[PDB]
């Protein structure tokens, strides 16, 4: 009678969360954390938004029960999510073509979609950008879906390699899923232009792909409406699509696990039938979603006063990151870098895709206490006026 | 192209949550909800516990960040959970043989265990009592495991058919998983005696089963410590086991999704190896767990004044249920019931397994607006002094 657990092989360290554990153990003073994608303020803290504290006070005073939510969550949360994604007067909403489930974070939204697709459709293959968020492959693989990669990044020109993207998707077949980052591509910070989105939408329709949009950073590139332009170009042309969205980043609600999975089908009767199977997949996973974080978001989005506060707080975050992008480039020059880092100013969202080699990233960590992901992704939102100079001195030292 | 969603078949309604939806839509003022397992107070509401409101006020005023929890959640939540399960000074805890992940509810803990087993071991088969919670089969099937049923309930004598149980489980092979309800069996309310638990534990080690305890009602049978005797008898003999537990019921925290999956192995090295793969399975599901509910539970359990308030609130809930069982039995006789219902007194937890037929349950709902599950399971915790009379008049009318 040998033990059931004896033949288990240890899992590898998560490329992002294993980094964050190393950083916590490091005892060297002055260490700098440019790893995980969270927003830091000017003092290096990860604060709760004021709009969120105000919403949480309202809930504390007014909640009378913790009775279970429905499988698909708070209804108002679903409607505000759809207006945010598709626009206040979208035909998708007027025609009742979309159904939304509240999920535990953006990850949970991706997993719900993966389980739904694997069990209820003939989808066998998901295409994701190379590079992408490392956990994408794991999520779809957990449902038994094959994941293939398409080309995306021109590391020479620090731009979208649109020609290779198109050519590498040639073998994606009708009924395959193709995953797009809605904005603030993780890790490159490089998003298609409106014209490029429009070309992709047309191509997707011709080849019969099922688009799946991952929206984790709406509002961090240019603005809430502008960041949804690519999705809305797809939505104007497609009968069917799926959107996984997260409120972790744009509400600073990381650990309350607030996200949404939105299904779009050709008509109301089809999406309702499909959605009943999405609800069945949720029920066999976590039963029904956590209320606190989604209640906060729904409270903020449906109160005009609280929403105006939140939109300003999100603008402040976006602008601080853009200021740090510019200060990073300038200080690298000041500190003696001969490599041209000006492409960082053109990149969107929390990160810059710097180009450092695995070996240089390792040197930064072991020698200077500066923590980036081994792909060379750095969280610009982790840079402050106080840590910018030592950070840049370290980078110049390993170049 | 023909759409990917066009041929999806609609899912059937959930036997518990579908009933709850019918109940909400029912326009009759006298309707009575005895379906889903939630606690009502004697005024018919589903309240937030006072310990919980106090903890939530502390969190509101002292939380400074929503930064991601680790994959396995709040550390003190894990330690307090192990202490509740195994006892203040257990050898499992002192030998560092146990690891706990905070999960989204008890359901989430079951799915995490199921995914972990399916993807990392040779387990193919899970054995569940007939009857059981209906969602058990769905969770394990969705992870790819086969579900087999063992006998449990003697319907003629309203008792545990221990001989039938032992005999059906002789077909369970070594390396199979056998699922036990820790206490307050759902739906029958009939638990093993301590002697019977000891017999099963011995039989379990000799046959090589991997036990999986589902603990959703610790504290509702006799007491926090007493209700864990059966699990602690298993833990004294086995090298390996899994406990999925829930704080939904005993904290009235249903919609915040607070549960735990606890892994036990033969030694510290093996459990840390196995737990690394459990974390991988979590990372590809919801990434990390929701903070608010678990923070509430950890604040209560780690503060002596709050814990004392909570333990009294749980005692009051348990005792109110016991008063309703007796009142239910006495009132049935007063309303003209032909049959002996005294076996209801011998059942533990929120429910009673009434023995009504599906056709009688259907009549109760359609003619009398009394909502019970089609199995005849009734939620005694939904009974109040004000609804007992019409409730019992309706039951007598359909006998
Ligand atoms: C592209 C992308 N998708 C999904 C996620 C996961 O978001 P969440 O924390 O809400 O699960 C992230 C970041 O965490 C992300 O960058
Ligand atoms: C035996 C059993 N296991 C698990 C659960 C699920 O607990 P939770 O709501 O926390 O997911 C329940 C009741 O809901 C239950 O009765």
Author numbering:
A (entry chain A), B (entry chain B): -2 to 396
Describing publication, verbatim:
E. coli aspartate aminotransferase (AAT) is a pyridoxal phosphate (PLP)-dependent enzyme that catalyses the reversible transamination of l-aspartate with α-ketoglutarate, yielding oxaloacetate and l-glutamate. During its catalytic cycle, AAT undergoes hinge movement to switch between an open conformation, in the ligand-free form, and a closed conformation upon association with substrates or inhibitors. Using our approach, we enrich the less populated but catalytically active closed conformation in order to increase catalytic efficiency (kcat/KM) with the non-native substrate l-phenylalanine, leading to altered substrate selectivity. Steady-state kinetics reveal kcat/KM increases of up to 100-fold towards this aromatic amino acid, resulting in a selectivity switch of up to 1900-fold, and structural analyses by room-temperature X-ray crystallography and multitemperature nuclear magnetic resonance (NMR) spectroscopy confirm that the conformational landscape is remodeled to favor the target state.
To obtain structures in the absence of maleate, we applied a rigorous crystal soaking method to serially dilute and extract the inhibitor from the crystallized enzymes. Superposition of bound and unbound structures for each variant confirmed that closed library mutants VFIT and VFIY remained in the closed conformation in the inhibitor-free form, similar to HEX, while OpenLow variant VFCS and OpenHigh variant AIFS adopted the open conformation, similar to WT. Overlay of AAT structures (Chain A) in the presence and absence of maleate show transition from open to closed states upon inhibitor binding for WT, VFCS, and AIFS, but not for HEX, VFIT, and VFIY, which already adopt the closed conformation in the absence of bound inhibitor. We next analyzed two mutants from the Closed library (VFIT and VFIY). 19F NMR spectra at 278 K for both mutants showed a narrow peak centered at approximately ‒60.2 ppm that is similar to that of WT. Spectra of these variants also showed another broad peak centered at approximately ‒61.2 ppm that is similar to the HEX peak characteristic of the closed conformation. The relative intensity of the two peaks showed similar temperature dependence, with an increase in the relative intensity of the WT-like peak as temperature was increased to 308 K. Peak deconvolution and integration were used to evaluate the population of the two states, and confirmed that at low temperatures both VFIT and VFIY favor the state resembling that adopted by the closed HEX mutant (T < 288 K or 283 K, respectively). However, unlike HEX, at higher temperatures the alternate conformation with the WT-like peak becomes the favored state. Interestingly, ΔE values for these mutants were smaller in magnitude than that calculated for HEX, supporting the predictive nature of the calculated energy differences between open and closed states for these sequences.
